[model samples]
Target chain A: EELEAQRQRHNDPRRPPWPLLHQRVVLLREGKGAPEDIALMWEQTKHYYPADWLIPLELTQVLKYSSGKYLQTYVADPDEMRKEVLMQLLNVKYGRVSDPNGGRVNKDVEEIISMAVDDLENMDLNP
Target chain B: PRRPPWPLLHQRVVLLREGKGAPEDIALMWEQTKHYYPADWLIPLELTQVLKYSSGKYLQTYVADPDEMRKEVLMQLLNVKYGRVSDPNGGRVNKDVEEIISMAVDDLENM
Candidate 1:
């Protein structure tokens, strides 16, 4: 238990893990929910979520409860998250965002679409 | 004068100790976590928050039991990433997570 061991080692009784988080989430992709991974969970979640709203306790719970052994954590946001980001990219490309982030995803998608219409588009398919 | 709650503090302290956080970073993290709560039923920010508060105050008040809860989160994430498995490749959202989560949980509990 990383949380427990951390609690014991740090001996911060005056803090008691401090403040008590109001929200937190933790998921082990491969299913091994070791407690010491708090650092990893915090880092990863931080990449996706805000820190103040994400407490270590909640993360510990996620890791503990989500330890699915060989099954793997059921929740994953990468693909959807990525898709949403793509849509955001395309949004501008298709003029959804108006400015199109200076034609980032929009130009890319359009250029590809136009290139596909070229006579030699799929001439090398499965080659 | 008040201490930050455990969830926030835990996450922050971990980040800080590991040299991953600063005051501005914590504020951004908090804001991002708070603002990202759009999907009402999905377990992203809101669910994470619920898990944090419930563990102490409500404990078992969760709509889903521990096992169910984990599965749901995994499923949602999978749904987001892969699209609905019920109708993969032509569905509304991620569904690959459902089968994978079930497989994971079954292996853990059954083992």
Candidate 2:
């Protein structure tokens, strides 16, 4: 309760994407909110957010890599975006073997994913 | 001393692991991020997911030995510095650690 209150009080521009998507993750994890909760939120507020790959990837990853479902419910470039997420998931999954370089080649991509994860945990939201 | 909180464990491990920080530091960063808890509460499901991701980070068998590393971590947590908190369950391999190890082994096999 205090965490929720603290999250509400925070007014940082850099916090928790927007309310709806943040809610989506919270709902998904808590396993109680309706699926349409995510669908409606994405439809209504996506214009306020980024169309960039990373942000979408962040949401998609948490959405269980349902890029197709993401497309049906939300934004564009689903095929490309899904592939990108699939690749990253793979990279994280096969961390050492496939990449002896320890993923040095894709540092930017890796950070993007990490930042997305962080956003889910750290982003502030009210409600 | 009370066992250090999980959040503090996280911060220290981040330092111990260099927090497995940003672009230039993928392995450590990924490991720490996936494994490190940001809050005081320990969520078994999420911890299991992190453990799986961590197990995948190294070779399935021939490398640092995720199993061995798991024990080392359990021991680290046992230290008064990390273990002062409530035991939630008594003994070395508590519920949280047990779930982590079980699922991580699942991930290793699937990998």
lDDT scores of the candidates, listed in order: 0.32, 0.37
What local lDDT does model 1 show for residue A76?
Answer: 46
Q: For each candidate, what's the DockQ?
A: 0.02, 0.04
Interface RMSD for each of the candidates: 18.2, 17.2
Q: For model 2, how does the per-residue alpha-carbon lDDT over B6-105 read when each residue is reduced to its tens digit?
A: 3333333333222233323333433443344221122222333344444354334323455654443343333312445433321123343344334434
* Per-residue accuracy of model 1 over A1-127 as CA lDDT, tens digit each: 5445444544644322211111112233222344344444444433322212113223323332233431132334322322333333333335443311111222323433232223122222110
- In model 2, which residue pairs have backbone atoms overlapping below 3 Å? A16-A123, B2-B84, B3-B83, B3-B84, B3-B85, B14-B19, B20-B28, B20-B29
**Model 1 chain B lowest lDDT segment of ten:** B87-96
Which candidate should be chosen as best, given DockQ against the real structure?
A: 2
For candidate 2, report its TM-score: 0.26
TM values, all candidates? 0.21, 0.26
